[PDB]
Amino acid sequence: DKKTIYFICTGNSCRSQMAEGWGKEILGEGWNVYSAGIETHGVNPKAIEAMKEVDIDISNHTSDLIDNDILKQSDLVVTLCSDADNNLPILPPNVKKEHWGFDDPAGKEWSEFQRVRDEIKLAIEKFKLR
Ligand SMILES: [Cl-]
Ligand SMILES: [K+]
Structure with a gap:
């Protein structure tokens, strides 16, 4: 279902x-939400703190590599960063792919972490109402 x-x-x-945090909160009733990267860098504490400000707990999240099994049965794969698409294999027709680009808040002002977090929320809300 x-x-x-x-x-x-x-x-x-x-x-x-x-995105995973907002996805679980907004899309949870009709969606299984996962996040991954071609390589793992660890869950950044500033991302945990950013989500904590808006009452979303992402402290139990893990930094995961892309899983072949989850990828193949995904209804929608969303790339959020500049090099993410280049590091994906050819996806079969049952999997839809979209790019929702967001600025990198790494090493930037706190107002930028908040802006990117809120832009991701807006994109996920717009997605729910498609
Ligand atoms: Cl990331
Ligand atoms: K994850």
Whole structure:
């Protein structure tokens, strides 16, 4: 019954972790939500803190490599970063792919972490109402 959305960004540390957090909160009733990257850089504490400000707990999340099994049965794969698409294999027709680009908040102002977090929320809300 539930469909599957896969948020992809190299590192699975910041943008994709926020997407997974918002995805579970907003899309949870009709979607299984996952996030991954071609390589793992660890869940950034600033991403955990950014989600904590808006009452979303992402402290139990893990920084995961892309899983072949989850990828093949995904209804929608969403790349969120500049090099994420280049690091994906050819996806079969049952899997849809979209690019929702967001700026990298790594090493930037706190207002930028908040902006990117909120832009991701807006994109996921727009997705739910398609
Ligand atoms: Cl990320
Ligand atoms: K993850």
